[PDB]
Amino acid sequence: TKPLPALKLALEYIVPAMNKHGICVVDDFLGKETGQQIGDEVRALHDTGKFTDGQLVSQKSDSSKDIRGDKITWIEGKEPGCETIGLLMSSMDDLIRHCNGKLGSYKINGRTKAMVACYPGNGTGYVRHVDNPNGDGRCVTCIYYLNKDWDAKVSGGILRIFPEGKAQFADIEPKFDRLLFFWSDRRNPHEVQPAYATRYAITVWYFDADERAAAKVKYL
Ligand SMILES: O=C(O)CNC(=O)C(=O)O
Ligand SMILES: O=C(O)CNC(=O)C(=O)O
Ligand SMILES: [Mn+2]
Numbered sequence: 390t391k392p393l394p395a396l397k398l399a400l401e402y403i404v405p406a407m408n409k410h411g412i413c414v415v416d417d418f419l420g421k422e423t424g425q426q427i428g429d430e431v432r433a434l435h436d437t438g439k440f441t442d443g444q445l446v447s448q449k450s451d452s453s454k455d456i457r458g459d460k461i462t463w464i465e466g467k468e469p470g471c472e473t474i475g476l477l478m479s480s481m482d483d484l485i486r487h488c489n490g491k492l493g494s495y496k497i498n499g500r501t502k503a504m505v506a507c508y509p510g511n512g513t514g515y516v517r518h519v520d521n522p523n524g525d526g527r528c529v530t531c532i533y534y535l536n537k538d539w540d541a542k543v544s545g546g547i548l549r550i551f552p553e554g555k556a557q558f559a560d561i562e563p564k565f566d567r568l569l570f571f572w573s574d575r576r577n578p579h580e581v582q583p584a585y586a587t588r589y590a591i592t593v594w595y596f597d598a599d600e601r602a603a604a605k606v607k608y609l
Pocket of ligand 3: 518519520579
């Protein structure tokens with residue numbers, strides 16, 4: 390058993406999947422050893438108190454209705470004790486680089502830092518939402534899941550995606566060493582169903598050059 394080269398995974402699987410469905414799941418992305426190291430680094434972030442409630446990020450005010458029960462932190466990838474998260478981010482970047490110019494009409498020219506997120510069980514989730522509804526430049530959502538032996542039947546935590554205007558929907562279990570791509574805009578409203586166990590994931594959003602520039606123009 391051998392890893393597929395990034396170029397081959399990108400052009401033979403990710404590009405066609407994305408252009409046909411707007412969603413692409415890649416399992417066994419990095420392997421057990423690396424995935425476990427990433428899990429250790431995320432758990433260290435959690436135990437040392439680096440997470441902030443995601444509700445604080447998404448709410449309009451402290452009176453707003455509940456949106457999300459996760460806790461998050463932003464990782465650049467070069468921080469001490471986050472080197473393996475940095476390797477994950479470089480691996481994502483390599484796939485996108487081999488895709489660029491073939492994912493719809495997008496020209497991807499940047500990305501966010503990594504959003505490390507924890508749903509601490511207790512029935513927490515994330516109401517249905519669109520990641521980028523107002524044209525802030527993000528065109529692709531990329532999520533890496535880190536949860537060993539996750540049993541959705543008992544622990545829940547399914548990501549459910551409802552592709553706009555299609556007669557289908559997708560259920561993504563937050564499985565260990567799974568990589569997920571999907572269009573960030575209104576085409577993919579999605580929700581995280583209540584999680585009854587600790588659920589970790591790492592997300593990066595990629596930027597489309599033209600839309601991000603236009604967003605900067607409205608910005609100014
Ligand atoms: O963690 C997941 O499966 C999905 N998370 C989100 O939709 C988000 O944080 O915006
Ligand atoms: O089928 C889809 O589009 C997404 N879900 C999966 O890849 C799975 O549950 O294995
Ligand atoms: Mn989302």
